[PDB]
């Protein structure tokens, strides 16, 4: 693997250090030479040292270890993610399709493209909910490992959303509960937790379980405030207003929730979402 090597050399030159300087208290300068030429994989001790001195998150050296064009792929991923957030499914569909037809080998990145492409296809009504789900399940059946440990959970969340908005509330709700459970086990990804609770809350609400919906909503609002996340907080206040209405709370409490939602939709420029707020 010569890709790791030149990434280390590139960043060392960029930092103005020589091999001798870099090797200090870590290893011999000749081992740095051999690491940069690709002739050797470094041990944990040595890598940890090099990453520290160069001020590079260690996962970076693993990322560039096998597949190419890692910086561009990461910006691509963040772009798609932003667009998905904005519900710009047409663009996602085109953007991801273009990338997909390069036919490059990189299972985890290819899986990400396919996941996003299918969801986009489904939202655009180019494919039916049942076919989307089956394709998504097939990505799962890949049992793909990968750098991003949460990718399968993200695919399960899409699957659960699609069951839920096509009448299969029980199946959707049970899948949401499984995701929250699998999350208990994994390291903290609290933004995702908030997102799953939100979708789950929507499904509970569609199933007329108003109290449980509000439970999930308030839990997710609490998590959002504690981590200072605005990603879903507008939607959550809106949802909580919905629950408050069905549960027959006082009009003021109901109005409060919707005002808080309208606040976030405004400042975050969520134009689409602003419609739902008619007559409340």
């Amino acid at each position: 693997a010569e890709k790791l090597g030149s990434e280390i050399k590139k960043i060392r030159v960029l930092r103005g250090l020589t091999q001798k300087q870099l090797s200090e208290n870590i290893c011999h300068q000749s081992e740095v030479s051999r690491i940069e030429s690709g002739a050797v994989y470094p041990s944990m001790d040595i890598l940890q040292g090099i990453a520290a001195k160069l001020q590079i998150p260690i996962i970076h050296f693993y990322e560039v270890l096998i597949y190419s064009d890692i910086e561009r792929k990461k910006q691509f991923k963040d772009q798609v993610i932003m667009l998905c957030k904005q519900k710009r499914y047409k663009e996602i569909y085109n953007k991801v399709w273009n990338e997909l037809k390069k036919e490059e080998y990189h299972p985890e990145f290819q899986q990400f493209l396919q996941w996003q492409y299918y969801v986009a296809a489904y939202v655009l009504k180019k494919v039916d909910y049942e076919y989307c789900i089956l394709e998504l399940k097939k990505l799962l059946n890949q049992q793909l490992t990968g750098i991003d440990v949460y990718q399968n959970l993200y695919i399960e969340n899409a699957i659960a959303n699609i069951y839920a908005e096509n009448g299969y509330l029980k199946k959707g709700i049970d899948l949401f509960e499984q995701i929250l459970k699998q999350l208990e086990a994994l390291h903290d990804n609290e933004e995702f937790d908030v997102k799953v609770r939100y979708n789950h809350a929507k499904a509970l609400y569609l199933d007329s379980r108003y109290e449980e919906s509000l439970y999930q909503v308030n839990k997710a609002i609490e998590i959002s405030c504690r981590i200072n996340s605005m990603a879903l907080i507008g939607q959550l206040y809106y949802q909580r207003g919905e629950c408050l209405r069905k549960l027959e709370y006082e009009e003021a409490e109901i109005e409060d929730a919707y005002k808080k939602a309208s606040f976030f939709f405004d400042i975050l420029e969520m134009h689409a979402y602003k419609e739902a707020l008619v007559n409340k």
Binding site: V119, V123, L206, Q235
Partner: peptide
């Protein structure tokens, strides 16, 4: 049910 599910 105007707000979409979040993918």
């Amino acid at each position: 049910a105007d707000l979409p599910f979040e993918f």
